[PDB]
């Protein structure tokens, strides 16, 4: 523009923030089922499972 007029550089607040910088998509299909992300409720320090030998 010019000095006579006033320039007002527009601005904005981004809704999306930076999330990560490391590849962490290695679950289920992304890793061909190698690593499985499951949602279940487990009681105690650990959860045992007994399968016949």
């Amino acid at each position: 523009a010019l000095s006579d007029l006033q320039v007002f550089n527009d601005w904005a607040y981004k809704t999306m923030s930076e999330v990560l910088d490391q590849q962490v998509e290695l679950f289920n299909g992304a890793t061909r089922g190698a690593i499985i992300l499951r949602s279940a409720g487990n009681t105690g320090d650990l959860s045992e499972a007994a399968f016949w030998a």
Partner: protein, 53 residues
């Protein structure tokens, strides 16, 4: 209660008897303040054993 409200009287005599007065006794209901010590309720312990905190 007036301790000597009724007194032996001699009609033949005419001696002065000490003037008496009535006083007022007061009762009392003391207030007692009770409470509970801080009870720790960490959500982590209940969550570890899958219990609603």
């Amino acid at each position: 209660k007036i301790q000597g409200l009724v007194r032996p009287r001699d009609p033949y005599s005419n001696a002065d008897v000490a003037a008496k007065d009535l006083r007022q006794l007061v009762d009392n209901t003391i207030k007692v303040a009770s409470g509970t010590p801080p009870i720790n309720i960490p959500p982590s312990m209940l969550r570890w054993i899958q219990k609603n905190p």
